[PDB]
Design a protein that fits this description.
CATH architecture of the largest domain in chain A: 2-Layer Sandwich
CATH topology of the largest domain in chain A: D-amino Acid Aminotransferase, Chain A, domain 1
PDB class: ligase
Assembly: dimeric
Strand content of chain A: 25-35%
Oligomer: homodimer
Chains A, B: ATP-grasp peptide ligase
Entry title: ATP-grasp peptide ligase from Streptomyces
Number of domains of chain A: 3
CATH superfamily of the largest domain in chain A: ATP-grasp fold, B domain
Radius of gyration of chain A: 22 Å
Strand order of the largest sheet of chain A: 5-9-6-7-8
Keywords: Peptide ligase, Amide synthase, ligase
Shape of chain A: globular
Number of helices of chain A: 13
Largest sheet of chain A: 5 strands, mixed
């Protein structure tokens, strides 16, 4: 039965991972949860909430925490001898693999890889560019820049094609540590903190600005790439074990209308066909071959001329893995054939009682008999600062309508 | 033809060894310096038209900056023309090397896109080898990819138990010197390391702090720390990787007497199923990743039969020139009926004087017998010294010949 849910990398941003829970499971959260939330999730999923436990840490789930003897003692009070227990971690770090040995739980898959912090290697943007260029995976023109002099020449070269370039921190997970560079006096860059103007004359000032903003002691690489305006954005998510890599779901990241803020996921993407699936399969099968075990997502784009490019991988939970998880649990493994889902990161925070009241006032609270409506993933999350909702429908236009009425009745943070 | 590219002088001839790669019409780029007789002698011994081979000198190492110098490009374009029938033969498939093939319109470097992302830099880190090795399942000694002084500290504590020996390695090092052994007992050896430090628990804090400071730099924020095993057999395998296959080239043994690298002997003694198969598996995955070119993998066999692999180097091994000479002088399956062995520390002397001592020893390379010695460098920074390479069909005979060279030409000690 039970696993330890471990999202390692009054706010309730980790509450959302309670939707992974089955009977006996433990959820570790670094923040708080609304104390009615676990019971409401158990009611919606049909599991016994009294057999689900929440263990609060007063701190993010760093490697130091996973090593902490006291923290280990609080988990061991659940796992006992370890028999029947597994660890379900967001990131297969060395401490996570260590944790499975100290609890005598089922050994982390890909243990030796994680013991060498293999997934740090995979979660670098330079590593993706290199592997993909070696494999032949569709990749934008770009450079693994090793200093600001390399940044200088790379901007000069790469700015020509589209008039737009993006420079990216080598390690993390989001469009915060990326900076756009644009030729046009405009700036429309989804997934960047800021856009700067190119300037042939002031080339060494720009390169310096980009170098010192995106590096540190541990990160002396920068990625510098030609940036394309995409018709379709998409990402694919997989689960890898010693047997296969299984496509789990395609989804779409939506941004608002320099710095487009991430506002939700739409899923069943519209980019499943051979020119995307099949190079992505080849690339994922190679990260499986080098030994990674766990969840991994690869994102990309399709241009209006049909060209496909893949931008990055992340060897960890996607932000959309839970959406797919509750979609599969409420609607069945087949749900993508006849269903659509979409998330709102943007609802005005309220307590769980008031959130559900507004979904009911709107007429769109999730209804098991139709399989349609909305569920709560967070009452007060930092994801898009606000309450997080997941909405289901068998018809895409009725989904859009539900989202309007939620926004109308629950409110949005503009 | 091809450009041979081993990527100031102090009057050394270290990279002259690569002349033995030459064929009719080839160009050889060198930093440092070479005896003007050395090309003709190598043409003489190899049986190629020496007036065809051209030698293009630069007074600085063949850095990335030199490879993207348009005046360096221009000197090369004098031999290449439109590019037709020419290729580049680089030691390290760097990004500039790949750029150079484009700017000379010569045949594209194999693995072009991978080189342009500096993928070779990724494979040539010991951290990368530990990670790929783990996870693929390749035998790997117990070790840690250390991220700070505190992790260096606990790594040494845990890892010291099994053997009483640990080795701390710079992430991008060039052989030993950059690798530091740590030992509970004073009489353990560590072939090829820089220092060997004492393990005393009451002083570990300082050990880890200073070990970190020695072995890191701005771009190297990893240290490797490994359980160190006493080995029966040492070996490395070299391969050539292209779009179709990984071809095993040779095995060889690095030789010592911490213990300095004195040379290497060929046919290794470690070519059996328990070695070849895991090496072939790892290397095939290197090929799948995209590396094209020469790659080698180091390993050890313990007395009990356990195999471990230590690192890979995606570049020419030091002994690829030896295997190349072996094939051209002795033929393609030489390793089945011949041995070879190199000497790195012979007393430096002019080519004329080195050949004369070889004749005086009675072991100057004799193409009628296939036996004897050729000169790879008269005064090189490898031993350091003059580098010879010696062939024989009989192992004990070759050992006798090496001793005659020692007497007659002298070595350093």
């Amino acid at each position: 039965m039970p696993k330890i849910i471990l999202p390692n990398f009054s706010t309730d941003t980790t509450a959302r991972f309670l939707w992974h829970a089955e009977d006996g499971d433990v959820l570790v959260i670094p923040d708080t949860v609304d104390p009615d939330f676990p019971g409401y999730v158990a009611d919606t999923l049909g599991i016994d909430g009294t057999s689900v436990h929440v263990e609060r840490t007063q701190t993010p789930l760093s490697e130091a925490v996973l090593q902490d003897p006291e923290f280990i003692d609080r988990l061991a009070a659940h796992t006992g001898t370890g028999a029947g227990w597994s660890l379900f971690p967001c990131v297969s770090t060395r401490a996570a693999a260590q944790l499975t040995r100290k609890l005598n739980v089922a050994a982390l898959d890909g243990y030796e890889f994680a013991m060498q912090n293999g997934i740090d290697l995979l979660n670098m943007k330079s590593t993706f560019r290199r592997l993909a260029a070696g494999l032949g995976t569709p990749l934008t023109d770009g450079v693994v820049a090793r200093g600001p002099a390399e940044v200088r020449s790379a901007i000069q070269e790469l700015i020509a094609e589209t008039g737009m370039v993006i420079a990216k921190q080598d390690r993390s997970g989001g469009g915060h540590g990326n900076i756009g560079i644009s030729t046009s006096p405009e700036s429309s860059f989804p997934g960047t903190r800021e856009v700067l103007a190119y300037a042939n004359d002031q080339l060494d000032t720009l390169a310096d600005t980009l170098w010192s903003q995106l590096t540190d002691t541990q990160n002396q690489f920068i990625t510098v790439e030609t940036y394309h305006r995409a018709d379709q954005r998409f990402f694919f998510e997989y689960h890898l074990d010693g047997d296969r890599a299984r496509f789990l779901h395609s989804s779409i990241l939506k941004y608002e209308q320099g710095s487009a803020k991430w506002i939700g996921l739409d899923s069943p993407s519209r980019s499943e066909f051979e020119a995307t699936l099949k190079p992505a399969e080849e690339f994922i099968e190679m990260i499986r071959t080098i030994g990674y075990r766990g969840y991994v997502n690869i994102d990309g784009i399709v241009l209006d001329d049909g060209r496909v490019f893949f931008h990055e991988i992340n060897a960890r939970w996607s932000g959309g893995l839970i959406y797919h998880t509750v979609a599969e649990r409420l609607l069945g493994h087949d749900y993508a054939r006849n269903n659509f889902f979409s998330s709102i990161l943007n609802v005005v925070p309220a307590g769980l009682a008031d959130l559900l009241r507004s979904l009911e006032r709107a007429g769109v609270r999730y209804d098991k008999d139709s399989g349609e409506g909305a569920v709560v993933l967070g009452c007060n999350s930092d994801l898009g600062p606000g309450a997080e909702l997941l909405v289901f429908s068998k018809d895409w236009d009725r989904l859009t309508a539900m989202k309007d009425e939620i926004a109308t009745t629950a409110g949005t943070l503009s």
